[PDB]
Structure 1
Amino acid sequence: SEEAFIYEAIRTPRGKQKNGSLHEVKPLSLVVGLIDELRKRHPDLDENLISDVILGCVSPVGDQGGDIARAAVLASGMPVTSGGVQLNRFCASGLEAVNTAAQKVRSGWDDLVLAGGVESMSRVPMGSDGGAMGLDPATNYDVMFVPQSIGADLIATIEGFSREDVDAYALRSQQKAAEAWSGGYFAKSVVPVRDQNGLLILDHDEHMRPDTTKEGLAKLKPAFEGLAALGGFDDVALQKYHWVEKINHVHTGGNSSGIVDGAALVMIGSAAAGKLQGLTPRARIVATATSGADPVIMLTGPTPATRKVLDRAGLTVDDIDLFELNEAFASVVLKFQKDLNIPDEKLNVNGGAIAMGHPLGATGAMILGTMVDELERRNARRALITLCIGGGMGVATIIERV
């Protein structure tokens, strides 16, 4: 019925894990800093119309526990009627919050909703919340738990992606991300993090290594060789994939996503709420979809999820101008490209998590706003955003520029 439009899409810079600039900033401050930025852009915005604040978070414990979305509503001085809910669909939590907000708007029961994510991996490390799929032996043994990194090497092993093939994409991600920052592509959407006194803490994605060379990547060691050997996870993966003889471990620290801190926030609302608040729509949510695939390799979810959202919107691969898949591992992007036969020119055009980092709960909302900017910058129409999810899930979203 009522269409869902994106009015704003902002994010913080991503601070690295070791000696990072954002290590001293608690996760709640990253969300409040973005709420304050949304206030600066629309001072006349009646915040009582905002009925919900939906934040994705993958480790909702410690600094990120106790429904951090509601803590951000109260700490930022938002009206007490603005809701606040935390969700976790692993690495797609950021995009799931956007889809849920768009679906809440499309139901007519919500007018204006804030969606986003937040993840401070330097303060709240991944896996701090536990879980049965890993810590409960009965379910670990039955589901055949295999870490995502082992599934990424198995994807390169099955598809024949060599160490040079994945390092080639890793080099490209550093280049496209470096050219994106130098060209001012991110100046309007990356909100510098500042302290309570206004002093600058971080204004750029400090995980990037713009001087990356193909020779320097070949000198790195496979970061998941000891994990597969001491943990026996290679033997587990090959029992499910029995026709594969040996797993080729090709992923290192240079072709995998970075562990970083960051947060993102998007504003979604109906066309009636936009005209009532004087907001100009940037893009329209065309369709959302949730699918999945085998959880042992875990990282082949984007392919059936992308096909489903294309059928829901009644479109093909040729009808989309920009494809944005999160760069959890290099082989995931190469496999998604081979599955749907996507040209290399329209896939993660401004670099991705390999260069700028992967803040779990926030990444889905970060790359979504990244595509909103590129649609308006290139004057293109449609863009598709998808991420691979733990447990073999998949979420995809199609947006159209307005």
Structure 2
Amino acid sequence: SEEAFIYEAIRTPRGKQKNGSLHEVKPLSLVVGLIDELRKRHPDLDENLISDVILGCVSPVGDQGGDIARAAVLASGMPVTSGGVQLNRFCASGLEAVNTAAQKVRSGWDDLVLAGGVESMSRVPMGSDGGAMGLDPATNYDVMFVPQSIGADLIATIEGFSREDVDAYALRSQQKAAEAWSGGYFAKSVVPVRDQNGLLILDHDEHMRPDTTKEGLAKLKPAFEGGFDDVALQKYHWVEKINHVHTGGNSSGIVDGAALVMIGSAAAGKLQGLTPRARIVATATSGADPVIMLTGPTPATRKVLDRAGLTVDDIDLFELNEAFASVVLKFQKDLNIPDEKLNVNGGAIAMGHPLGATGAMILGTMVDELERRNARRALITLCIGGGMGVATIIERV
């Protein structure tokens, strides 16, 4: 019935892990800053019309526990009726929050919804919450648990992606992220983080290494080198040995960050004088084998295209999370994606992958790039741990 429109999509800069700028900042303070920025953009916004606040958080413990969304509603002084709910679908929590927000708008039982994610990995490292598939031997032994990093090396081993092949893509992401910053693409969407006195804490993505050379990427050591290698090959028996191609320079960065997206119906936006920037065309979820794990995007992207009656040639921009270099190359190989349509402003390898917020970050990144290019459609998708996948198609308005 209804249609879901994106009116605002902002995010914090991504501060790195070691000696990072956002380490002193609580993850709640990151989300509050984005709420305070949305107020600046629309001071006469009736926050009573905001019926829910949905935040993704993969490690929802410590500073990120106790429904961090609800704490963002109370600490920011938003109306107590504005809801507040945390969810965790691993690496897609940020996008699943946006998709769930849109599906609540289309159902006619929600008017205007905030969505996004937060993940201070320097304060709450991944795995802090525990988990059954890791810390329970009965189910770990049965589901053949293997970390995401080894499934990425297996993808490169099967698909024949050399160490040079993945490092060649890592340089591409580093270059295209520096160009996007220098070109001013992120200026209106990256809200710098400040303290309680207004002093600047961070204004740029720290994890970027823009002076990266292909010779320096080859100096790095395969960092992801238990019995997970043997556990993986027990499932993929036709593979003899796993070529560990991924290093810290061609894998996603471990950073802190947060993202927010305002989603509502055309009536809700017209009621508050908001200009829609994009429209959620369709969503979809689907995955693949949990051992290789990171092959979930391909069926989910195919499904979201069949649902909206579109094909690859109808999409102007593709945006897949750069969790690992081989994942994107495998994705580009399957759907035959043009090289200039894929992660055009860099990705997680350069700027970082704050688990809970990455889905909403790359989502807003495509909204800002469709408008800058005056293009029509964009597809966002991410690989997920445990073998899942989510995909979303947006249309510029």
TM-score bin, normalised by smaller chain: over 0.9
SS in structure 1 at match of 2:58: coil
CA–CA distance in 2 between the matches of 1:371 and 1:134?
34
Residue 317 of structure 1 aligns with which residue? 312
CA–CA distance in 2 between the matches of 1:147 and 1:313?
33
Deviations 1:372-401 (A, max 9, x none): 000000000100000000110000000000
Deviation (angstroms), 1:193: 0.2
CA–CA distance in 2 between the matches of 1:306 and 1:97?
18
SS in structure 2 at match of 1:390: coil
Q: What does 1:298-317 align with in structure 2 at a 5 Å threshold?
A: 298-317=293-312
Deviation (angstroms), 1:19: 0.3
CA–CA distance in 1 between the matches of 2:372 and 2:75?
34
SS in structure 1 at match of 2:286: strand
Residue 116 of structure 1 aligns with which residue? 116
TM-score by length of 2: 1.00
Deviation (angstroms), 1:31: 0.2
Deviations 1:314-360 (A, max 9, x none): 00000000000000000000000001000110100000000000000
SS in structure 2 at match of 1:94: helix
Deviation (angstroms), 1:46: 0.2
Deviation (angstroms), 1:206: 0.6
CA–CA distance in 2 between the matches of 1:275 and 1:259?
39
CA–CA distance in 2 between the matches of 1:390 and 1:203?
30
CA–CA distance in 2 between the matches of 1:354 and 1:346?
17
Q: Is 1:215 matched with 2:215?
A: yes
CA–CA distance in 2 between the matches of 1:213 and 1:390?
30
CA–CA distance in 2 between the matches of 1:134 and 1:341?
35
CA–CA distance in 2 between the matches of 1:189 and 1:97?
19
Residue 154 of structure 1 aligns with which residue? 154
Deviations 1:81-113 (A, max 9, x none): 000000000000000000000000000000000
SS in structure 2 at match of 1:292: coil
CA–CA distance in 1 between the matches of 2:236 and 2:365?
36
Cα root mean square deviation, aligned:
0.3
Residue 399 of structure 1 aligns with which residue? 394
Give the number of equivalent residue pairs: 397
Deviation (angstroms), 1:218: 0.4
CA–CA distance in 2 between the matches of 1:94 and 1:146?
23
Residue 270 of structure 2 aligns with which residue? 275
Deviations 1:209-241 (A, max 9, x none): 00000000000000011xxxxx01010000100
Q: Is 1:244 matched with 2:233?
A: no
CA–CA distance in 2 between the matches of 1:135 and 1:312?
38
Deviation (angstroms), 1:78: 0.1
CA–CA distance in 1 between the matches of 2:382 and 2:177?
18
CA–CA distance in 2 between the matches of 1:162 and 1:290?
30
CA–CA distance in 1 between the matches of 2:308 and 2:387?
23
CA–CA distance in 1 between the matches of 2:334 and 2:298?
7
Deviation (angstroms), 1:257: 0.4
CA–CA distance in 1 between the matches of 2:109 and 2:218?
54
Deviation (angstroms), 1:4: 0.1
Deviations 1:128-167 (A, max 9, x none): 0000011110100100000000000000000000000000
CA–CA distance in 1 between the matches of 2:271 and 2:347?
36
Deviation (angstroms), 1:50: 0.1
Deviation (angstroms), 1:63: 0.2
Deviation (angstroms), 1:296: 0.3
SS in structure 1 at match of 2:378: strand
CA–CA distance in 2 between the matches of 1:255 and 1:375?
26
Residue 7 of structure 2 aligns with which residue? 7
Deviation (angstroms), 1:170: 0.1
Residue 337 of structure 2 aligns with which residue? 342
Residue 349 of structure 2 aligns with which residue? 354
Alignment gaps of 5+ in structure 1: 226-230
CA–CA distance in 2 between the matches of 1:54 and 1:367?
17
Deviation (angstroms), 1:281: 0.2
CA–CA distance in 2 between the matches of 1:199 and 1:304?
46
SS in structure 2 at match of 1:6: strand
SS in structure 2 at match of 1:274: helix
Deviations 1:12-51 (A, max 9, x none): 0000000000000000000000000000000110000000
Residue 228 of structure 1 aligns with which residue? none
TM-score by length of 1: 0.99
Alignment gaps of 5+ in structure 2: none
Residue 322 of structure 2 aligns with which residue? 327
CA–CA distance in 1 between the matches of 2:326 and 2:18?
25
CA–CA distance in 1 between the matches of 2:150 and 2:210?
27
Deviations 1:278-311 (A, max 9, x none): 0000000000001010100000000000000000
| Identity %, equivalent residues | 100
SS in structure 1 at match of 2:386: helix
CA–CA distance in 2 between the matches of 1:181 and 1:104?
34
CA–CA distance in 1 between the matches of 2:372 and 2:102?
23
SS in structure 2 at match of 1:221: coil
CA–CA distance in 1 between the matches of 2:44 and 2:123?
36
CA–CA distance in 2 between the matches of 1:135 and 1:150?
19
Deviation (angstroms), 1:202: 0.1
SS in structure 1 at match of 2:119: strand
CA–CA distance in 2 between the matches of 1:382 and 1:135?
42
